[PDB]
Structure formats: C-alpha cells, structure tokens
Design a protein around this ligand. Structure first.
Ligand SMILES: NC(=O)CCCCC(N)=O
Ligand SMILES: NC(=O)CCCCC(N)=O
Lengths: 262, 262
C-alpha cells in the first residue's frame, strides 16, 4: 500500500528461478524485479545467492571467467542506476576461478558499490571445491537511516556470524541465499532465533523452483526482532515488499569468556 | 509406557511452584517428584532453578546462610540415594552470601555429586546483585551412555553457551530454569535453535504458577536435535517423562575467526 506513517524504509526481496550459465536471462530477471520494486516505492532490492549465473558452484568454477563475472557486475551496477534503487546481489568474487569466493555487494541507487562481503561459511563439498572462503567479518554501514550488514546463505545458520554483524552495530542484516531440500528449520527455527538473540531484522531472499539439479524452497522472509515474519513468500516466484517499522543479550553476553570457549 | 526398544535413557522433568524460603516444603516436593519419576522408570530427574529456596534472589542473598544451603544440598543428595535416581538440582553456591553464585549440580542414584556448574549469565539487576557470575565453561560427562552437560536458565539464551557445551562433546544439555512473564520465544524459538544449531537434545525444567512475586510460565520441554519437542508441559504442575532415542555445524564453523569477531 501507501508508505505508512512510522516507517522510513521499505525493502523488497526477489524470489525467482535462475537459468544456470545464462546471465543475460538472469540479469533481465533482476532488472524486471528492480523496476517493479522501485515502482512500489521500495528503496532497496535484495536478490538471491549467485543469482546471475545460477546456483551451480562446480559449473561456475569450470566455465565462468573473471571477465564474464566483471561484465555481470557492471550490468548490475547499471540496473541499480537505471531503475533508481539500491540493490544487493551475489556473484562470484572478482579474482580468478581458483582464487575467488562467493560474494554479496550493496550498490546504491546511483550504481556505486558501498559494501562488499565474501561468504565465510561455505556449504558442502561442491562450494568448498569451487570457492575460497572469506576471512573478514561482515561489514556494517549506515544507509537509509539504519546500520545495514550483509551475510550469505549458510553464514546465517551460525549464530556467531550474525553476532559478529550485531556486535558491530547492525540493525538490518541482508542475506542472499540458495536453500533447497525442504530445509524448513532454517527459515522456521534458525532465522527467527538470529533475530531474537540479537534484536535485529533479517531479510532472507531465496531462489525457488527447478534450477541446477535442485528444486529450491522459496520461503523468502523478513524476520523482525521479536522473531515474527514481517512478510514471507511461499514456493512460487515473487517480489516481497515490506515496510520496516521505525533481555539485552548484546550487553549481557560475557564475550571475553565466550571467545575462549568456542 | 514401557521402556521402548531403541531407547536406553528415560529422563524426567519436574515442573512445580516453590514456596520462597521454605526448603522443607520445596525439598519434600522434589522428593515426591523423584519417587514418581523413579517409579516410572526414569533414570534421572531434572528440577528447576533455585527450587529449594524458591526463585527469590534478593531474599536468598539477605536471609539464606551458607549453612542452610549446605543442609538443603545434603538433603538433595539423600533424595537421589533414597529414591534411587540421578538428580539435577540448582541451589546457591556453597560460599558466603556475598561470594556465591547460582549453581546446578548432578548427583547419581548413589547420592554422589558428579558435576557442578555455576551460572555464567545472570539475568537482571536482582540476580546480579545477589550472586556472583560463574567464570567456567559448562562441564561435560559420560552418564547413562551419553555426554551430559549442565547450563542454567538465561545461559541457554546465549548461543555461545550451548556451543561451548557441544564443542566439548555434549549430547544432552540439562537446564534448570525460572522463566516468568509469558516469554514464549525462549522455549518456542531459542531452545529449538540451540538444539538444531548443535545437533543436541536439551531439557528445560521450569517453575510454574505464583511464586515470589511472579507467575511462572511452565512450558517445561525436551527438545531434540531436529528442534522438535520430544515432550512438553503446559502451565500446570507436572512431571514430564521422555524416552530419548538411541549440515555439520560443529565441524564447519570457523571457530578461530569467530573467536576474534565476538
Ligand atoms: N547456499 C548455501 O549456503 C546452502 C545452505 C544449506 C544449509 C542447510 N542447513 O541445509
Ligand atoms: N532465571 C533466569 O535466568 C530468567 C531468564 C529470563 C530470560 C528472558 N529472556 O526473559
């Protein structure tokens, strides 16, 4: 509807099926989503993990060059500009095939990249074979009047990763993902916990449908700091649009002890 | 019912109202529970936080001497013996009023204390004024064919505390608690997450009803490693009896990085 009294940030999440190794098609889909999100008055669009090339880690590593990643990145910056909306995307990193990870980046409505992050927790043997894990903590930055951060997919399943973002001041954690296999406890159990245990909002944007030998769950969701869904999708493609409203675990935690016990 | 094929541990949880500063009454209640649990073939009974003196931290600190704590402890060891069942209880620690914390201890069916733990995360100003926080990680020990551990109440709300137990090999985490205020997201959201994110079982034993200026939630529960309740109580007093059946987060986690980011 209309932007409410008492909300100063409206976000959008893209849920859709990508075609493996067809970035012209996948980027066209993000362009359409960015246009529809901007038309609904969203200021930011979050898109799923590796969407541009499809979630096909072994085939990315074998077939997708650094020049082809750079061209998709350049076009995504163009979409943020031409559609006038901040965009979070996830591509392979910019290094060579054997040296790059899986990334997430935030570009503003001018097409400038404000923040970049390399996925720390790679999932399973195919990712671990195709990508190098990140070594840096998630970034946190002011945008639209809140502290935003980025994490990718499996990352958010580790309470430590979200705690790292929140400990640096994050209020809204944006998470491109690619979750298949009817893993209902991730959105159902883990994500609400991450939100509650840190007093933060998390946005989780998944693929859906048949893609790269898997069938993705959909279930994209924005979870508020009480653990409740501010909005959620089912299994079908969709554009989720949400207005964010305007125990103190982060202070009580004995971090110095905890760091020695992990 | 009968002990099932495929289960070699049956546990019991006591949910009840304590009377503040009346350990003869409160220990009589634990004695009754221990008798009923043992009659149902349970090998261990878990009881709630500070049950013996009631959950009244400021009044414990002001009125309950080290000799009176020691006498209750001695009697609880007697109950484990006389009723022939392992018992987990939670009392003030054995030091002076100004030096003690909140503890949990496990005694075997012979009345010998196998493990002791001092609550690390104290909750709110009254606890923090009445008790000294623990400084040690949770203990983990073989008993009944599994690795058992202990945590207390608020502790379990910190993913780091349960991760510490699981990283030392815990399979079943036993948690005396005192949760009031209709805090449904603790049993509803956090506990299932703790179980899933570590692949462990957690038993959570609460007070219920009117006690010490609060009304306790009940909602005692045993949560399995899929995050599902193996058994649970509502708001009324009860004895919950459960048979325990016979992503690899603990291996994937980049603990060395995580320890620097908390
Ligand atoms: N792209 C990913 O990180 C997939 C995460 C799957 C995690 C899970 N728990 O099944
Ligand atoms: N005895 C306790 O540790 C009370 C925990 C209350 C925690 C909560 N989240 O409200």
């Amino acid at each position: 509807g209309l932007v409410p009294r008492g909300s100063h940030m409206r976000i959008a999440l893209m849920q859709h099926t990508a075609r493996p190794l067809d970035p012209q098609h996948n980027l066209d889909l993000i362009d359409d989503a960015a246009a529809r999100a901007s038309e609904q008055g969203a200021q930011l669009l979050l898109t799923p993990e590796l969407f541009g090339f499809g979630y096909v880690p072994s085939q990315i590593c074998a077939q997708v060059s650094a020049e082809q990643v750079d061209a998709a990145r350049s076009r995504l910056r163009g979409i943020a500009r031409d559609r006038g909306i901040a965009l979070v995307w996830s591509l392979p990193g910019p290094e060579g095939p054997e040296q790059r990870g899986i990334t997430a980046e935030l570009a503003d409505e001018h097409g400038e990249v404000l923040a970049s992050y390399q996925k720390v927790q790679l999932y399973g043997p195919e990712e671990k074979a195709a990508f190098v894990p990140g070594e840096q903590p998630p970034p946190v930055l002011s945008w639209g009047g809140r502290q935003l951060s980025l994490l990718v997919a499996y990352d958010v399943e580790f309470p430590e990763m979200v705690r790292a973002a929140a400990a640096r001041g994050a209020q809204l954690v944006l998470v491109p993902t690619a979750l298949a296999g009817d893993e209902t406890s991730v959105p159902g159990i883990l994500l609400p916990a991450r939100a509650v245990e840190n007093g933060i909002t998390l946005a989780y944007a998944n693929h859906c449908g048949p893609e790269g030998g898997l069938v993705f769950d959909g279930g994209s969701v924005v979870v508020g700091p009480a653990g409740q869904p501010l909005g959620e999708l089912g299994v079908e493609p969709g554009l989720l649009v949400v207005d964010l409203p305007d125990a103190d675990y982060l202070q009580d935690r004995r971090a110095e002890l905890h760091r020695n016990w992990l």
